[PDB]
């Protein structure tokens, strides 16, 4: 936040709205300054987030952060079947191959 | 439902409709408050069209969960724009607007059973 506060920006209108709703939610304390409200939110792991596809702020603070995620040994291409007509067996006419 | 703010009566006080209302604008009792019988939001914001109340919410003046006054199919109703929005959803879905309002229930929230 200090980066922004210095850079020549501040509490966005959207952030203001989100804070206003967060008050009625009961995460922030009523009475402090927008910066302090955002501080309280940032303490609980939560933070303002924008929709992205609209620019309308997600009315309600949500928790963001970097967690650890692996990719599991299974994939999709390992398990993929889509044959209509193909090989059968001489021993049994049920299709496989 | 928030803090009472200041005072909790309009069960019958004839003065409370014109006076207590101003109170919220002063600082007394907030909007969706159990100020008895109704709340300022039911006095202050009376939306004519059922649709118009929803147009209002797009302008951040009343949330979809604040209790206000609307008018569906011709009669005064005490509810949130969100609930009336649900009602209209259930309507436009099946096109028959009559049974739409009748089959649902607009007095409680919606859950599994509902």
């Amino acid at each position: 936040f200090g980066k922004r506060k210095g850079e020549g920006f501040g509490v966005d209108k959207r952030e203001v709205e989100v804070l206003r709703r967060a008050e009625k939610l009961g995460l922030v304390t009523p009475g402090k300054t927008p910066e302090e409200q955002l501080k309280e939110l940032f303490l609980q792991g939560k933070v303002v987030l924008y929709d992205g596809r609209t620019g309308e702020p997600i009315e309600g603070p949500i928790v963001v952060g970097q967690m650890f995620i692996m990719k599991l040994y299974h994939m999709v291409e390992d398990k993929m079947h889509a044959r209509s007509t193909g090989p059968y067996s001489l021993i049994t006419q049920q299709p496989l191959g | 439902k928030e803090k009472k703010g200041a005072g909790l009566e309009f069960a019958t006080p004839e003065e409370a409709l014109a006076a207590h209302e101003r109170g919220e604008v002063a600082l007394n009792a907030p909007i969706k408050v159990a100020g008895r019988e109704t709340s300022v939001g039911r006095l202050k914001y009376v939306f004519a069209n059922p649709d118009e109340a929803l147009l209002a919410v797009a302008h951040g003046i009343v949330d979809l969960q604040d209790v206000v006054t609307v008018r569906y199919m011709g009669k005064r109703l005490e509810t949130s724009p969100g609930r009336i929005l649900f009602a209209r959803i259930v309507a436009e879905a099946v096109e028959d607007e009559k049974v739409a309002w009748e089959l649902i229930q607009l007095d409680v929230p919606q859950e599994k059973n509902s």
């Binding site: 922004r4 966005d12 959207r14 952030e15 933070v47 303002v48 987030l49 924008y50 929709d51 992205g52 596809r53 997600i58 963001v64 970097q66 967690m67 650890f68 995620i69 692996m70 990719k71 599991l72 299974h74 994939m75 999709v76 291409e77 993929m80 044959r83 | -």
Partner: protein, 123 residues
């Protein structure tokens, strides 16, 4: 001859070539109809190593009746796609559903988008 453009060695396909479903990997016949080895409907990729165990084998097993085996190491790099299985250390398994482009993704007030989106209803 187009199918043999990869076949470098006398019988063996080249190393570093691209093989695809249906591509000819090894060439050989029996009683003269083609009974070669081709790449199955799954996928090939890029060949990285080719081992051959001839008859003049400096001390190997080799199965009965067989004269020489031809094994191929076809490698391929696969990226995270819709359908792969993702999980953490805390134990939340879950497939990938959609790969929303950078634009229409939840982003902070700072120009930083979010990488992964987890449903709270799983907690």
């Amino acid at each position: 001859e187009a199918a043999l453009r990869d076949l470098d060695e006398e019988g063996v396909v080249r190393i570093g070539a691209e093989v695809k479903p249906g591509d000819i990997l090894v060439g050989r016949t029996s009683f003269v109809k083609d009974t070669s080895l081709r790449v199955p409907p799954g996928e090939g990729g890029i060949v990285v190593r080719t081992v051959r165990l001839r008859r003049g084998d400096p001390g190997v097993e080799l199965k009965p009746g067989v004269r020489e085996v031809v094994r191929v190491y076809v490698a391929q790099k696969r990226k995270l796609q819709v359908g792969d299985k993702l999980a953490n250390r805390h134990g939340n398994k879950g497939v990938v559903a959609k790969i929303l482009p950078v634009e229409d993704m939840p982003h902070l007030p700072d120009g930083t988008p979010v990488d992964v989106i987890l449903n709270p209803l799983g907690v």
